[PDB]
């Protein structure tokens, strides 16, 4: 089962997946800027992976069957890391990030089931 396989894979890799909210269309841009700032700011031992889940849906717009690549979760990015005082700022200060999405006030980490459900090619 791909679900079980990815569960096993993501179990070992370090970090906890968090959710970041951006300005709607600033998703690939935010990913690129964050992956560049992770090297420029030397916080590469805390931030490990940035994912923007997408999936392709065929649409017959104007009578034209086209497989356009949509975004599963529009306006959110998935970041695997260990939250600290430096990582939090390095993420929250990326141009195009609206801030972390948390449960009550502080950042909350997704469960492996949810992240597997969206990092699996749809």
């Amino acid at each position: 089962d791909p679900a079980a396989a990815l569960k096993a894979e993501l179990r070992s890799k370090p970090g906890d997946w968090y959710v970041v909210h951006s300005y709607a269309g600033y998703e690939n841009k935010v990913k690129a800027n964050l992956e560049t700032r992770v090297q420029n700011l030397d916080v590469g031992d805390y931030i490990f992976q940035v994912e923007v889940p997408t999936e392709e849906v065929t649409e017959i717009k104007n009578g034209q069957r086209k497989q356009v690549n949509r975004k599963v979760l529009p306006g959110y990015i998935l970041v695997r890391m260990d939250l600290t005082d430096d990582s939090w700022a390095a993420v929250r200060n990326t141009p195009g990030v609206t801030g972390f999405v948390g449960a009550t006030s502080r950042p909350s980490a997704l469960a492996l089931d949810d992240v597997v459900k969206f990092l699996l090619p749809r």
Binding site: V19, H21, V72, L73, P74, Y76, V101, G102, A103, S108, L110, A111, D114, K117
Partner: protein
């Protein structure tokens, strides 16, 4: 029309994010923003910016 459009957009996004399945964090974030949109529609500036 702008204030109604914001409400409609937020409501449609939340409605689509529920049927699609999503964690509780994201759904609650969408609900909070929907709550803030109706507040702006009824009385803009009574709470916040």
């Amino acid at each position: 029309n702008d204030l109604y459009r914001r409400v409609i957009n937020r409501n449609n996004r939340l409605k689509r994010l529920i049927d699609l399945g999503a964690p509780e964090i994201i759904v609650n974030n969408e609900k909070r923003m929907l709550q803030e949109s109706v507040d702006a529609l009824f009385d803009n500036g009574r709470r916040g910016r």
